Amino acid sequence: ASTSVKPIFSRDMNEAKRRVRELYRAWYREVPNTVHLFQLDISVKQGRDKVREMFKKNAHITDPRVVDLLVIKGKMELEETIKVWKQRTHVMRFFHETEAPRPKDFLSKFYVGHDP
Amino acid sequence: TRDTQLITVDEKLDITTITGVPEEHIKTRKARIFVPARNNMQSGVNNTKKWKMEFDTRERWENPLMGWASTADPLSNLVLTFSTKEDAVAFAEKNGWSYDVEERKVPKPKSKSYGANFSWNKRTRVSTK
Amino acid sequence: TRPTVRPRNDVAHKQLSAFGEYVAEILPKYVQQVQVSCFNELEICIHPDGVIPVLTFLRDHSNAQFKSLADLTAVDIPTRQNRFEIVYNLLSLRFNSRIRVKTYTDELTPIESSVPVYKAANWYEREIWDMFGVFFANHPDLRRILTDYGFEGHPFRKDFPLSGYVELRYDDEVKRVVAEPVELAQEFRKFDLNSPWEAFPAYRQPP
Amino acid sequence: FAYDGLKRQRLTEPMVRNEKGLLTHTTWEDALSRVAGMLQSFQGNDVAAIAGGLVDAEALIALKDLLNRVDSDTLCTEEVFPTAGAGTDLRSNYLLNTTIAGVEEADVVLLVGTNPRFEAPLFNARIRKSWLHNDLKVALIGSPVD
Amino acid sequence: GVRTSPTGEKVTHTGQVYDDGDYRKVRFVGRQKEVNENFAIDLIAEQPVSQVGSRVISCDGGGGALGHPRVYINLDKETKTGTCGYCGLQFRQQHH
Amino acid sequence: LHHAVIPHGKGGRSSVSGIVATVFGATGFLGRYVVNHLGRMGSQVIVPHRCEPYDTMHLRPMGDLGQIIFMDWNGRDKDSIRRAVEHSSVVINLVGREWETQNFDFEDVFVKIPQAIAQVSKEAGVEKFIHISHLNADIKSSSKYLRSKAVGEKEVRETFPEATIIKPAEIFGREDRFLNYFANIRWFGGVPLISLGKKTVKQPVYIVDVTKGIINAIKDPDARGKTFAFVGPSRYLLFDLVQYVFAVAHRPFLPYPLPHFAYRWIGRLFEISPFEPWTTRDKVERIHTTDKILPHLPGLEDLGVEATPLELKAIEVLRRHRTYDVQPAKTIPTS
Amino acid sequence: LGLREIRIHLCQRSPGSQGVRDFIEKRYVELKKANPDLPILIRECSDVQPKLWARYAFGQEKNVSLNNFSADQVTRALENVLSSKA
Amino acid sequence: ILPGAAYTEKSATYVNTEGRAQQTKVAVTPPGLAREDWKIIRALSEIAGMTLPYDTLDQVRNRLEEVSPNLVRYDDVEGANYFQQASELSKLVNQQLLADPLVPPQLTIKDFYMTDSISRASQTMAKCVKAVTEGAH
Ligand SMILES: NC(=O)C1=CN([C@@H]2O[C@H](COP(=O)(O)OP(=O)(O)OC[C@H]3O[C@@H](n4cnc5c(N)ncnc54)[C@H](OP(=O)(O)O)[C@@H]3O)[C@@H](O)[C@H]2O)C=CC1
């Protein structure tokens, strides 16, 4: 009974993946309209790779309820872009154009500060 | 006997991807689960009854203009309170933080006797009141 | 009377205890606990499956007529298995009384939307979603209401830091407003205020 | 009260010696490379180390691995402990095996060549607590000290 | 009182002054450094020691409710004077 | 030295980078990007300015409280220069002008003024000095702009031997006068060019790349007493490059030739303007001068900066010129 | 090249390390007399699977699990390292 | 000179005289360019081509567990035993006891205040030494 829980939308991972793919198609077909309405300086290929990167991060989830939430947030984040509730600043926050690269190796982190 | 249909989820409960915390502050942090030690300037024991969870200290530097204490750690002041140790570890595990647990330190019972102050042959006979 | 102590109203304490029992006898399937506070407020604690049954009964029954939803909010308690406590505050113009209905949930278990019972719940449930991350099933329009577009996290959770994770700024190079990790010129100072001496022995817990 | 020493005489920058033999500040890159070059030019018994009184276990193990990777085993400490016999092979040889809390269970204590009042004040405080309540017997072999 | 450093920058009553090679001094170019000229440590040293004829005297800072919390000072030691912990005034017992 | 400024923090807006820099000519095109990059990491920036204080307002939001400090300075006043540099660890010289005024000529701004800053910096004990020369600097050039650049590039190299001289090609950006120059010719009907734009090859570079190069030269110990050549990744003909600009701006393109002497004649006519002239005889020389190749000098790649193509960021600059995919122009392979 | 250090980990009450416990009790003093200059570190914690670490020149280490071994069977493992070196 | 961190500026393990292993926690970060002690060695090794196999504090404590497993059992007093084996070895060689008396290095309170770098840098420990030498005056 402990592992018996109420679902959000999908009763198993197989149905969850169906929602993930439909969401990906929605984002894939919107980038050309987004890059045009907001007059962005990125290309459509750069836009479509960012969507790919965002989906790739959460590729190790095995909880259908968690996947449902990620899709719910994705659909919310999508409705903001389509209806132009966001602004050019919000869309470009996925890219971090004004943040200097931060080193990933041990030696470089050693020279600058104390964080691991 | 609920009316709603239930499903089975045999996986570790992990919410690291829906809490919105940047990955910089999930993998490199080290939570500390503990019961606060009694403040030694006071005899009260009412601050040593709940379990706390704090994170590891990081750099504080001096503001060039005024001399204030600047920081870049967004978890410097975060303190959580828990009724028991088991509930504290549960919150750390599902949030993805690495943690250390320190067992509660309760003072051991002491044997007190006002009459020992005036012993006939023992070493506990005090010399002043 | 004592000039400095709030007076007690024993009449209203007996009437609200009778009605609390009255409600628990009619909905055993859902009511888990009924308590009346020392300042005469009534709390009905329910299983989360009874949000629609219990609320519909209180709105429509001839002896309840709680036709107005005063407020709907959530409280976050990290130490419980179900962190989030959902609170409904109701009003009755017919009998001039108030009542509080409480249920619970967690990060992943949804709760049924109350818009069918109270049209007032439309925006309150968006606010609970935006600030706590509690999903309400069958909501006509669920989305962030108070936070900024693209905001990550639910700021009213007890583990979300006070100053957040990012801060805004205008960058001249890119000619727009940018978001960056937050660094504070003066760190917020944390005061440990609680006294180590018990204040109220009436609320002492078993050791 | 000795914590205010952490605010004086502190080392804040890497330092190397210049041509006129005086220590001058430098970057981390310069200092480590100068040290790194010498460590590559030696091995075996040409490299040694000494550990002080306030060094942690993490640093002790790390330095050991660095010297081992140049095949050196001359890892020394400033505090002498006899190596004749079992030496540091058995922990029981160099520990307080009765534990601090076990002095309260003793009935006779023999102190040899030590002044616990100053080498370990809080452990001396425990002997007195046993000397007062449990009626302990204490003998000393050494100089008369209070 | 205010005394100037070898580089020409005034010293505050807390002892603060930028060293010669400290880059932070650039904030004062074409501007000034705010220093209060009334050093409180000097001002309270000019006040005369008040002679009293009791073992214990009380100080409230003057003005009654406009001063500081009322404290009682012991004057049993003739080696030194009795000093108020709030306002810094001094009291002494008359030859006994 | 007792100690350096000991950088602290995460490199953000409120950090301390240990850089106390005085930027001369920080109110122009290039200084607006250098000050931003210095303030974005928490540096102390002293900005000596000659103009009205209202014209330096866009620099205030570029740093935290007290990190941007403004002073008055005069080009010919040595005392004013000294006040601005005696507390600094690096001095950056961006003073320049594309035309001669009533009171300042190319000699005054490119030789005398850079020499005064360098000499006073040496006497004040500054450690790093960064001077901005031109790629096409040459004492045997038809442009008096480029002749003075060469003379100044030497007197600076003699007054401050450990100077990091940066020699960029024509820079392009939002506020540039290079791509914005080949878009306002539309106001005069057709696009004049010498030899129809042939015989001239240019290697323009991006503003941010030049700015990122300057910052890395401050932090790199291997840039003292060295000369660099910041050039773009491609070489174009002056014709197809202008052809590309009009394509991106989406404006009619009528390139008709005009002889050299005629261009100077119309060049002198604009010089009569008491305001910023639209064009000048000197400007025409540099626009029709081929960008040199100096393989023996280090470039951007030696400072860690990767050159940005003109195609990736041409739209960013020319978006405004559009009224109410463009094929890239041809390039000249390196043999 | 040559051997540098032998490390023996064992428990104090578990049966999985009873064999290693008997080896130390009976035939550790003889082993030390044979190799007085060899550091033989016997570090016994609580509830740990027993092991035998051996350190060779230039920081090479080889470890063989000693779980459920016996005194006669623990001698062979130490003979291997003392005789065969990497 | 490679500047390190004091015991109040690093999470480090110390073992007391009874074998109990405990750990400090970071109160303040080290001053200036000072760095955690084990990070200096782990950074010197990489620049020398001898990179060590641990990059984090949790990893360097796995290594400690290999060398001596009791160094990660925090607040546990692991017993040692084997006194008999230790006593038999000690008799294989004899040494002569010097005639000099046993004299502890610290005889009076005067010698207790300054015994390490930090206490020698303390201005409060210097006022304690002059107090027990001259007196209150
Ligand atoms: N822009 C480009 O394409 C190229 C730039 N360079 C060089 O880089 C440097 C920066 O030029 P840039 O910013 O792009 O163009 P700007 O003309 O916009 O910048 C010129 C700066 O120098 C100041 N200036 C001019 N004359 C004086 C004077 N007598 N006294 C004090 N200040 C003066 C100006 O101050 P104020 O505005 O108050 O008058 C201004 O801040 C120049 O030296 C230039 O030769 C070299 C190759 C390419």
Ligand SMILES: [Zn+2]
């Ligand atoms: Zn007073």
